């Protein structure tokens, strides 16, 4: 504690009462005329001292970019395998190789290698770090075993048992009676004296100090953001970023497995998403009388951010207005992720232990790729990995479509990507021969959305293979018939007629699909009859409990009536069954106390404009919007309020 | 402090039981540009749910060696996909929290049914 | 680690592999007669301990903090200290109280003597806690000495030296090379085996675990707020509240001095203001298709552990006036106690500096937060008298003290007694005016007190100020132009007498006359004075620039815009500063220099006139739209909705 | 990253010098006649690495601030004396002061280019 070293790299005299050795060392370093008066042995040691100080930081005294070099951080899953294959020259080469083994799943091999390194360690810091990393590997193995036993059956549908029962028993026997907190005390006195800086690694919660510092800095940054104060010197945001990089480089460079645990993931997610929030607030600075994402930021967000965390970050701040630098490196990282997923799932399943650890980062990277410009080759590789080979359990049809459409934002759909979408649709149609099979999406988007995207980006695209299937279609396979029905715009004219031969509007869902594809442009009397018959059925089923589903059909009928698409006045008989139908059918007597502001989100420019121009229900909606904008920070209610003044 | 009952969709078998902890329905409109015609009322309805203490049925565990959710008013999700995102902590790990997302079949086009 | 005890008070078997003693124990608590007599007595003791500490039942199936230090019973604590301490246990909380009232030398000596007398301790827990508290008191003494040798010179002006150099040298000698982290390890192994739960108190950073857990809970709550999800069981907000109360009660009931350090203050400030923000979000939460109120303890926590700026930030982020305040009688008693303490200490030879540094930060916060609480006339009068006459002016200047007074008046209208107190304050201020200047960090001088008096009476005439004015003479200009700003309070004869020496020499006198109402329309003399001031400003303007916060030019521009000035000579000055051209020539303003922050200074009349211009309304509407969409002030949105300026 | 000089108002002696760390200028709005443009403006400034002058120190054993970066002058700066103790020993002293405005002058801060 004689001196104070901080993130920027400038030493500060803190508790030094005797001669100031650090100030003199810096003076001798900056003025190297003297460096010769030093004893030759002392000068040789000073050379190494300067090298060590400049590599780590400590650029000079207080009064006067990050590069993390590790195959684990960069996701070089292929270089790491080759490195593991090569015979290890030294013990440190075995320690790094064991860390790499742990990175690529393979926790059994990593545990065995760490045990061997501990055995052969007779500096003394390699044995300490191997003990810590072996404890971490045992912890991860135990947690993964518990998850596979309990959760694995549900998530994967089949029990896995990546680690043999004999191995688990052996590791339990070995690691029992091993107290992590006493791992440092039971060390040679020389090691304890020299390696006092490693003490914090011994405890099972070593990120508490860093987490507390990040909490204090976050509170300070939030205070500045709320008050609007101006920070002149090294801002707390810069301090947070510098400490985040210090921790990331220290844990990854030293091959410490604790970098893969939930505590560090949450620490990095909070360290980021606070730089991002402050950066976004900086653009909205109130003038009175920038921060951009590099390759490292992209990698950190991909690794340590869950999809929900990225969604929240997007919600709070418009993250598409943040400049994304090093886009070549980001695209290389994304292509590497896509190639790894393709290599895994294209042939012979995958490594379940590695899968559980890597799928989160793969999904986060492909979700965050919306903000980067990807070349046609890289974009095609990413799309093929996302659609064909990405696990079904992780990304369903709707979520996968959202990922693809987000990718489409920065890079418009080319013909190469259109071909991938086309053969993905062909494969999905091929899957639609089993009557039990049906594509279910948690988002609510389906293959028809892929067809709509294809048409939107081409508007003249004709799918040869789907048209071929339609021409081969017969009445026997009804599932293929109604799957191709939703893809009618992609089908050829002959295919269109051949499919329409067996296609009939039997139910309301069929009519809705026909409207969506474009087969229906004006309601014929038969369609009105079907709609009214469905409304009769719903009302009859209504008539002492009430159940409200999420079908939304009644809201669609109400919107149709409000827009004059349906011009038969029999709908008023059903008024009172469900809201958002009375609002559009009879707005005047709707008793808007039941009105839901969220409804206004689902409407579009045409419907919102009609609602605003109604002038017999506009005032209530304007009130709802005004209170929603005042109370909430959504910023979409404000957009609705000011775009049409509804 | 309401309970969530997990059932295998095919039969009445109980996959597991838990207590509902967090339920988020962030269902709003999607992109406008990317998707004169008759209105269709596009939507991106999403329903996530979390369960705090879920214990898997012993018979189901033994047998294992589509899912439905009944949240008890009574809510029912005919189709739910459990998101198996496993993360480990340095603090030896103990609450097994199960997150699942409601799915919507194209024909039914309904995700959740809440009835009194 | 055999079981897991949660804040709610329910145990969960987490690691106990053998027979479950707690599972059977809870049912055994819920046929007990079969137990032995000794076993029955021991179970009674265990049940009392468990129910007093909140461990109620098992997983399958408010707070009261008892301490004079928490409640600020600064006189009951003094009485307790005076009483002869029968036992060492009674002398431990007595040393804690000594520390709580300043008196750190006495507290350190008492802790040292407790340690000396704790040789025959049955358990030694008091000895360990006394070591912790003595280290904390030594830390406080050292930091206070450093502050007094530093900031204590700028603040207070003088050098204080509360602790004698001999005492400081002795404590430094005793505390030399004292590693607090080792204190628990350097204890009899019986103590370490039994008192394992007290180990966390040893380390110099013992709130790191609590801070980290609060950080995790804050992240969870903020994620819930952003996503808009609904929590069903014990919400993370409730967990945060429960852990905050547990920590507060443990640290205060056990008389631990670490409860007075910045770390614990910040922990409590973050634990609160996260409950408050979550409650505000819950209030303003839209319904979809498919409360929190502040008690007496919450008021005490906010007053103690919140700086004035922290309370300001909390007010900015969320509207606190919409959070119903409970236990208002206890809150009023607490505020009256704070005011009574301040008045008693400063009215009689002053308050000792060591206690002042601790107590003023809480007194200011309590009187700031008193805005949302409803106080009786007697309590409100006591609070006002303590705030005006006796509150130190090195902390609450005239401008900030007026803000405090008006915030107190917000909820409860100004009564006759409070108006009399304000009249006494104004009379004292007038008698202060000597080559004495009234500098205010807020820009709200004594004239604002008279303005408040008139606003709440509109017919109040202060007798003493009128008599003073009658006794004014031309020689004392300071008192003359001080009462000139207080003209509405003076009597008609006093007004006439004061106007004899009162002349509008400079623009400041014109400003004061307009504020007091003496001026309702510009005579040619006032127009000439303003034009000559503009002449001099332009002449001195014409190679370095100077920006000032006088804002007179903005006032002239506003006067032109509202037509209150009807002389077409102001256009000659266009270009000296902005917000003057904005009102003089709105069309040719080139609004690229426009500052959105201006619109907050305008009032209903000015802003309505600006909105109705229709020749400059569209640029300002664009600016307001940008501010509303970007910033979260919600005042720009209020402006936009009120009149779409 | 400029420098702040704290000087005695009357004598003009420099009480100390430190590094400016934070500055908040938040001026905003019960409180037919002529418009006076009444405003309630506040300026707070938190300073870093403040070391008191040896001369003024030994003498002590109204103020002005000059914050030079372009060129800022705060007359009548009242130094707030909020003292808190950290259980972690201590690390540099941080000084906070509020700009004061005299009634006659009516000016709180000055900007010099």
From TrEMBL, chain D:
Lineage of source species: Bacteria, Bacillati, Bacillota, Bacilli, Bacillales
Source organism per UniProt: Bacillus subtilis
Protein name as annotated: Uncharacterized protein
